[PDB]
C-alpha cells in the first residue's frame, strides 16, 4: 500500500531472458506451426473462431519493440499461442501434438528461469 513496498525481484534481466526463451522456442523442431500468424485466407474457421490470434513472430516483434510491460504479459502471449492451438486443433493431429510439446517445453524453461 501507499509507502509500504514489498521487496521486489531484480527484473533487469527479464527482457534478455524472455528473448532467450523465445529463441529456444523458435528453434525447436516442433515450432513450425507457430512461427508465423495463421493465414486467415488459408484456414477455414480461424478468423471467426480464434478471437485473439498469436504466434512466435508476433511475440518477437512485440518483445523487440517494448510492448510487454513485464514478464507475465509475455508469458500470457506465449500461453495464448498454445491455448488457441488447442481450441482449433485435435490433440491427435501433428499440429495439436506440437502445441502440447511446445507448451511443456516452454513451462519448464519458464519455471527454471524465473521461479528458480
Ligand atoms: C502460415 C499458414 C499456413 N497455413 C496452412 C497450414 N495450417 C493449417 N492450420 C494451421 C494452424 C492452425 N493452428 N496452428 C498453430 C497452425 C496451419 C499453419 C499455420 C501457421 C504455420 C506457420 N508458421 C504453419 C501451419 N495457414 N497459415
UniProtKB/Swiss-Prot annotation:
Tissue-wise expression = Expressed at varying levels in several tissues, whereas a smaller transcript was expressed specifically in testis.
- Subcellular location, record wording: Nucleus
Domain of life, per UniProt, equals Eukaryota
The record's disulfide annotation reads none
Describe the location of the Bromo domain by residue ranges. Answer: 9-113
Q: What does this protein do?
A: Regulatory subunit of the ATP-dependent BRF-1 and BRF-5 ISWI chromatin remodeling complexes, which form ordered nucleosome arrays on chromatin and facilitate access to DNA during DNA-templated processes such as DNA replication, transcription, and repair. Both complexes regulate the spacing of nucleosomes along the chromatin and have the ability to slide mononucleosomes to the center of a DNA template. The BRF-1 ISWI chromatin remodeling complex has a lower ATP hydrolysis rate than the BRF-5 ISWI chromatin remodeling complex.
**Subunit arrangement?**
Component of the BRF-1 ISWI chromatin remodeling complex, at least composed of SMARCA1 and BAZ2B, which regulates the spacing of histone octamers on the DNA template to facilitate access to DNA. Within the BRF-1 ISWI chromatin remodeling complex interacts with SMARCA1; the interaction is direct. Component of the BRF-5 ISWI chromatin remodeling complex, at least composed of SMARCA5/SNF2H and BAZ2B, which regulates the spacing of histone octamers on the DNA template to facilitate access to DNA.
Provide the family line.
Answer: Belongs to the WAL family.
| Protein name stated in the entry | Bromodomain adjacent to zinc finger domain protein 2B
Q: Which organism is it from?
A: Homo sapiens (Human)
**Taxonomy-wise, where does this protein's organism fall, top ranks first?**
Eukaryota, Metazoa, Chordata, Craniata, Vertebrata
Question: Covered residues of the complete protein?
Answer: 2054 to 2167 of 2168
